[PDB]
Amino acid sequence: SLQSDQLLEATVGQFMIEADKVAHVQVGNNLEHALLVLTKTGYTAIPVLDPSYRLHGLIGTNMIMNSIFGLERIEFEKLDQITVEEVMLTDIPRLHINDPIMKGFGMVINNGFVCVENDEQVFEGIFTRRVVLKELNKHIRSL
Amino acid sequence: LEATVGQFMIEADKVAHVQVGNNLEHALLVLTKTGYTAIPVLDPSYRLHGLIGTNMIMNSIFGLERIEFEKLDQITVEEVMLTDIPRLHINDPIMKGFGMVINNGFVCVENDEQVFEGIFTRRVVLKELNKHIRS
Ligand SMILES: Nc1nc2c(ncn2[C@@H]2O[C@@H]3COP(=O)(O)O[C@H]4[C@@H](O)[C@H](n5cnc6c(N)ncnc65)O[C@@H]4COP(=O)(O)O[C@H]3[C@H]2O)c(=O)[nH]1
Numbered sequence: 023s024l025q026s027d028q029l030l031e032a033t034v035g036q037f038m039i040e041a042d043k044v045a046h047v048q049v050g051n052n053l054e055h056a057l058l059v060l061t062k063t064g065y066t067a068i069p070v071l072d073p074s075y076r077l078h079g080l081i082g083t084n085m086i087m088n089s090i091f092g093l094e095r096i097e098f099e100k101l102d103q104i105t106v107e108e109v110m111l112t113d114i115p116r117l118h119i120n121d122p123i124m125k126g127f128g129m130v131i132n133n134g135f136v137c138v139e140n141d142e143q144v145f146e147g148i149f150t151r152r153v154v155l156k157e158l159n160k161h162i163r164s165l
Numbered sequence: 166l167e168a169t170v171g172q173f174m175i176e177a178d179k180v181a182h183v184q185v186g187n188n189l190e191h192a193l194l195v196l197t198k199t200g201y202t203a204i205p206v207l208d209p210s211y212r213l214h215g216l217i218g219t220n221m222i223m224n225s226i227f228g229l230e231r232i233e234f235e236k237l238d239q240i241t242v243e244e245v246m247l248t249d250i251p252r253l254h255i256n257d258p259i260m261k262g263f264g265m266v267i268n269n270g271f272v273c274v275e276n277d278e279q280v281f282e283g284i285f286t287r288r289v290v291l292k293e294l295n296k297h298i299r300s
């Protein structure tokens with residue numbers, strides 16, 4: 023455990039949720055698969071990788087619903103006809119594992135989580151608001 | 166800080182919500198159109214009954230192998246909404262709200278009469294903490 027005066031020398035990677043605990047899907051998976059992963063894991067948005075573990079975007083329940091809401095009914099038969107790549111968000115913030123934690127703190131003001139990558143955009147984890155708030159609450163209650 | 170939750174909350178007039186007495190088709194429509202992933206459930210006197218969100222809706226119609234969208238108009242918001250939720254008062258110290266958003270993306274705020282007055286969000290907390298940290 024770090025002391026308060028060390029927290030800003032820390033890196034994103036030291037506090038991220040590591041990739042092997044992160045639910046994610048792939049660019050070529052269909053929306054039925056992505057919706058099932060979102061629903062079973064209980065998350066509203068998760069990262070999207072390719073088969074080489076490169077980070078490409080985010081997919082969420084709201085995006086999927088907006089793709090299948092029809093005029094008169096929910097067109098669920100389209101879920102397995104559409105790929106994640108066609109509807110995912112690609113305009114996403116990114117952190118590097120070696121970025122200073124203060125950069126991560128700033129980015130979660132406007133983002134519930136931020137994806138973390140190594141070199142070459144290889145996915146490494148996510149940097150969440152809960153981790154920031156848990157840590158900052160500890161250090162304010164001590165100070 | 167010496168400030169209160171009420172000084173930093175998002176006021177109720179800005180808050181998307183679902184009215185009691187509606188079904189999940191309506192709730193899912195409101196969540197989808199507004200883009201919010203979870204929002205308060207209120208009655209017409211603006212008292213707070215629970216929270217409703219897309220994760221709870223999808224899980225409530227998660228069948229054997231598929232999400233059963235056709236059932237949404239058969240299920241009430243009340244049957245699915247989360248009711249075991251924290252609540253803040255407008256004069257609670259801000260540190261109480263800070264602790265409550267560790268595990269909650271937002272916490273509802275009520276007044277003296279238990280009428281809904283706003284939500285205390287992680288963004289407002291993080292915005293103030295960043296300013297206080299950076300100073
Ligand atoms: N009590 C409780 N709270 C939960 C649970 N799952 C999530 N939460 C809380 O809800 C917040 C919002 O979840 P989200 O699904 O809308 O956004 C989540 C989700 O989009 C993503 N995320 C978090 N952990 C993830 C993970 N392990 N894999 C994939 N995505 C993940 O990061 C966002 C922010 O996570 P967080 O931990 O800071 O805040 C959670 C967390 O505090 C849960 O099962 N129970």
Ligand SMILES: Nc1nc2c(ncn2[C@@H]2O[C@@H]3COP(=O)(O)O[C@H]4[C@@H](O)[C@H](n5cnc6c(N)ncnc65)O[C@@H]4COP(=O)(O)O[C@H]3[C@H]2O)c(=O)[nH]1
Binds near residue numbers: 131133288
């Ligand atoms: N809960 C909530 N938060 C919101 C809402 N609108 C904005 N926010 C939050 O405030 C930040 C600043 O919003 P802004 O309108 O002052 O600047 C916005 C705006 O200038 C632009 N932008 C974002 N989404 C846009 C969009 N959909 N269309 C056009 N411009 C958009 O990018 C800025 C940063 O957006 P962001 O999502 O990273 O951060 C938001 C976001 O975290 C909102 O309606 N609800």
Ligand SMILES: Nc1nc2c(ncn2[C@@H]2O[C@@H]3COP(=O)(O)O[C@H]4[C@@H](O)[C@H](n5cnc6c(N)ncnc65)O[C@@H]4COP(=O)(O)O[C@H]3[C@H]2O)c(=O)[nH]1
Binds near residue numbers: 172173175176286289
């Ligand atoms: N605590 C608090 N601050 C507020 C509130 N309304 C406005 N503000 C402040 O005034 C600025 C301009 O508000 P706006 O409604 O004209 O644009 C807002 C609004 O359009 C949107 N937004 C942010 N959080 C939102 C939220 N939770 N719900 C809906 N819209 C939201 O983002 C814009 C920029 O937010 P900001 O926090 O950077 O600056 C706010 C913020 O500093 C409010 O209800 N509570």
Ligand SMILES: Nc1nc2c(ncn2[C@@H]2O[C@@H]3COP(=O)(O)O[C@H]4[C@@H](O)[C@H](n5cnc6c(N)ncnc65)O[C@@H]4COP(=O)(O)O[C@H]3[C@H]2O)c(=O)[nH]1
Binds near residue numbers: 284289
């Ligand atoms: N640019 C932009 N950013 C947005 C918008 N809506 C949300 N955001 C951002 O995404 C975060 C997660 O939103 P959410 O819908 O998953 O959870 C939201 C939602 O569940 C709820 N919430 C926030 N503003 C609300 C509002 N005005 N009405 C109802 N519920 C609201 O509080 C959660 C945390 O809000 P926040 O402002 O700290 O973080 C937002 C905010 O930073 C939006 O319309 N535009």
Ligand SMILES: [Cl-]
Binds near residue numbers: 134151287
């Ligand atoms: Cl959040």
